[PDB]
Amino acid sequence: PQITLWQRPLVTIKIGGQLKEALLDTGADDTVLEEMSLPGRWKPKMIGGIGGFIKVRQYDQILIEICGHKAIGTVLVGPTPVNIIGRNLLTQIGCTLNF
Amino acid sequence: PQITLWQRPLVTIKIGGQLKEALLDTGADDTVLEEMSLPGRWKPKMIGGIGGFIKVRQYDQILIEICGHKAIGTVLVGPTPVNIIGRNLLTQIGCTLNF
Ligand SMILES: CC(C)(C)OC(=O)N[C@H](CCN[C@@H](Cc1ccccc1)C(=O)N[C@@H](CCC(=O)O)C(=O)N[C@@H](Cc1ccccc1)C(N)=O)Cc1ccccc1
């Protein structure tokens, strides 16, 4: 799909058997999702954005379905206001910017 | 131009007679540039990002050149780590997401 930017670029993602909406963020290096029930082990980690830093939990090789496109990568879980799909997962679904 | 996401989507912008690099951020509603010499009036404003909020100064109808494409719109100035070009300006240079 092509996506204009008049509205937030929100998509439907399936991660860990659950359905959620996330924002495609070309400006995020990482993918950060709000508190959720995820299976597996993890490691503590601090990450920054505008406003400061937040503590999240790192989960590697997690399966995720973004608009039907499957991908496996690191996902971070913590106190984020919105679910953010970063370039780590965006490169995997062949997502480009165009103008 | 088409832009893959393996590297940060950094572009060259000309704003206020000065040259800078900014990140094309599909996940930013607004355009936030780091402290810089801008002409005109402004209004105080708090905005949010992942780690909390930051106080910036709002400047409306500012001219900006992103990769040769001219655009006029609101730009926010404050303690941001990187210059962010938000959807307000991205819609103006006809920028889309694709996959
Ligand atoms: C997700 C991680 C991995 C933490 O990366 C980034 O945040 N990357 C930033 C891209 C921008 N991504 C979004 C992430 C986001 C979005 C929504 C909510 C929470 C987080 C953002 O900060 N967007 C801000 C950019 C500044 C701006 O637009 O004014 C935004 O759109 N904020 C809105 C929406 C908002 C409201 C309240 C709270 C938070 C956000 C606003 N109106 O202030 C760039 C960056 C890189 C490194 C260091 C600092 C900054």
Swiss-Prot record, chains A, B:
The active site is at 25 (for protease activity). It comes from Human immunodeficiency virus type 1 group M subtype B (isolate BRU/LAI) (HIV-1). Disulfide bonds: none annotated. Residues 20-89 form the Peptidase A2 domain. This is Protease. Homodimer, whose active site consists of two apposed aspartic acid residues. Residues 1-5, 49-55, 88-99 are annotated as: Dimerization of protease.
